[PDB]
Design a binder for this molecule. Structure first.
Ligand SMILES: CC(=O)SCCNC(=O)CCNC(=O)[C@H](O)C(C)(C)COP(=O)(O)OP(=O)(O)OC[C@H]1O[C@@H](n2cnc3c(N)ncnc32)[C@H](O)[C@@H]1OP(=O)(O)O
Ligand SMILES: CC(=O)SCCNC(=O)CCNC(=O)[C@H](O)C(C)(C)COP(=O)(O)OP(=O)(O)OC[C@H]1O[C@@H](n2cnc3c(N)ncnc32)[C@H](O)[C@@H]1OP(=O)(O)O
Lengths: 148, 150
């Protein structure tokens, strides 16, 4: 599956998917600010990105970063998906689903068979719709003294 | 907390249980250890790849040198780690060793400044992790798998 794909063209702009890991940490910070996520040191955001097995992006080209998902992984059995995000201006258009499909497909192409995530209650059904299953066989996602 | 650690010294003949986060596991011993606890044979090439790309590989060894325990974690090196493949040789279970292994793993991840330490727990070991300070579904967060076949 190619690194870059055009997911959509509309008249007014195209929406570009990429798995090359092309994220500017200021862009990602500004996007994270829109959904009100608290800021974290740019250098730590940068470190988290280059130590992610998969960094996937949505861009708006007329490049504007409008979405992103990333995954840690051991490159053999497991990947865990983090920081899934779509610009609120671009939500409700199917782009978040389209991002996650290409993410899942890229991981399966790389022979990662155990694809996991920790879903906020608000977005559980979004992932179920994509085929994720909570607590299969009673397995529990657990956190060491979380600060949530 | 150092790289390598005598957790315990005992007699029956003198045995030491040694902790290490160096990550120098012999993949063939790890393969037999995986087999001993009843996990299916995985290809050597994929197990080794999983070791090399694990941010943390922690072992327990018996020196009288035998691998008797292992735990590993993936990480993004900054914010998140997920712990996988915690196992203790059945002949060494029920001795506090799994607890001691996990405590050293948690401390190592904390020393590396990882805030979010996570894992997915089989329902029959959920209480084992609760006893170490893990919490299931905080704020209703759910761990999810894509079309799992367990
Ligand atoms: C990273 C994690 O592991 S936790 C998840 C992180 N998410 C966040 O908290 C960030 C904030 N939210 C967002 O960025 C966005 O709302 C997203 C990523 C959650 C969703 O992306 P969007 O672009 O809004 O969703 P998109 O339009 O693609 O939605 C597609 C489908 O999901 C459904 N859907 C969308 N949002 C939700 C939701 N919150 N709950 C349930 N279903 C949903 C839609 O009905 C649609 O269904 P369809 O296939 O039947 O048409
Ligand atoms: C791998 C993952 O990511 S999830 C883990 C799934 N692993 C497995 O199912 C494989 C098989 N299990 C094992 O290898 C071992 O049983 C382990 C790792 C689960 C535990 O190791 P052990 O060495 O048996 O445990 P240890 O003796 O250290 O026990 C620690 C404490 O937890 C308790 N405990 C041990 N096992 C369990 C259990 N299954 N459920 C609840 N409590 C337990 C013990 O009673 C002990 O309590 P105490 O300190 O109050 O006396």
């Amino acid at each position: 599956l190619p690194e870059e794909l055009v997911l959509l063209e509309r008249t007014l702009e195209q929406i570009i998917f990429s798995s090359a890991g092309d994220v500017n940490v200021y862009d990602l910070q500004a996007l994270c600010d829109k959904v009100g996520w608290p800021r974290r040191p740019l250098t730590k955001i940068a470190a988290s990105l280059r130590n992610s097995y998969l960094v996937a992006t949505l861009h708006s080209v007329t490049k504007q970063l409008i979405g992103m998902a990333r995954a840690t992984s051991d490159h053999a059995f497991n990947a865990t998906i983090w920081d899934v995000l779509v610009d609120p201006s671009y939500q409700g258009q199917g782009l978040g689903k389209a991002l996650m499909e290409k993410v899942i497909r890229t991981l399966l192409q790389r022979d990662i068979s155990n694809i996991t995530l920790f879903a906020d209650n608000k977005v559980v059904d979004f992932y179920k719709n994509l085929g994720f299953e909570a607590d299969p066989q009673g397995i529990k996602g657990m956190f060491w003294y979380p600060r949530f």
